[PDB]
A paper describes a structure:
Different AAF variants are expressed by different EAEC strains, where they are required for the bacterium's adherence to small and large intestinal mucosa. As with Afa/Dr polyadhesins, AAF consist of two secreted protein subunits, a major subunit (A) and a putative minor subunit (B). In the fiber, subunits are linked together by donor strand complementation (DSC) with an N-terminal Gd donor strand segment of one subunit inserted into the hydrophobic cleft of a neighboring subunit. In this study, we report X-ray crystallographic and NMR studies of monomeric, donor-strand-complemented major and minor subunits of AAF/I from the German outbreak strain and AAF/II from EAEC strain 042 and provide an atomic resolution model for the structure of the entire fimbriae.
The DSC-monomers of the major subunits (AggAdsA and AafAdsA) have a classical Ig-like fold that consists of two β sheets packed against each other in a β sandwich. Instead, it has additional strands C and D, which form the edge of β sheet 2 (CDC1C2FGdA2) in this subunit. Both strand F and the donor strand (Gd) at the other edge of sheet 2 are longer in AggAdsA than in AafAdsA. The donor strand of AggAdsA inserts seven classical donor residues in to the acceptor cleft, which is two more than AafAdsA and other structurally characterized subunits from FGL CU systems. In addition, AggAdsA contains an α helix in the loop between B and C1 strands, which is absent in AafAdsA. These features give AggAdsA a more elongated shape than AafAdsA. To examine if fibronectin is a common receptor for AAF, we studied AggAdsA-fibronectin interactions using surface plasmon resonance (SPR). The experiment revealed specific binding with a dissociation constant of 16±2 µM. We focused the mutagenesis on surface patches comprising proximal pairs of lysines (including Lys51 and Lys109, Lys55 and Lys103, and Lys73 and Lys76) and the three closely positioned lysines Lys73, Lys76, and Lys78. All the double mutants exhibited significant decreases in fibronectin binding and, despite the absence of the cooperatively expected for a polymeric AggA fiber, the affinity for the triple mutant of monomeric AggAdsA dropped below the detection limit of the experiment. The pocket is particularly well pronounced in AAF/I. Three closely positioned lysines (73, 76 and 78), mutations of which practically abolished the binding, are located in the loop between the C2 and Ć strands at the bottom of the subunit.
Residue numbers in the entry: 7 to 156
Write the structure that this text describes.
Amino acid sequence: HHHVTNDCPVTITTTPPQTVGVSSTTPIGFSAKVTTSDQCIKAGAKVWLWGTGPANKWVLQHAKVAKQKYTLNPSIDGGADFVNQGTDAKIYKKLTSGNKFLNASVSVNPKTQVLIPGEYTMILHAAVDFDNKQGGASQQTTQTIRLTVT
């Protein structure tokens, strides 16, 4: 029903960098949150979050060794959805004035997923879809989540 004349921002935050010991058994949480401007929410903006893995799953990737990685399936807030009823892990949410954030998280369980020392990064992509004067448009950005082991 509405279009904007300044493109919607895509505003993502993530968990700050974490450090853990190789022998820790505690679950490690990582989360991301996406929003946009109040005017874009009024206009009907839809925000997105996705990873770089198969089916847009989130990948915690060792800096040195290509094959060392964990592909993680996200959990999302109750107002968000997965693409195609969950056949893909890409996430979207139509924001509203009473519900302004898309929130999602993953977890590494050291008990089932072995912890190797070193640096890990996890790339997340976020976007916002809206209409401007030329019709459908989107802006996207990226942020990298970090984990240091031992």
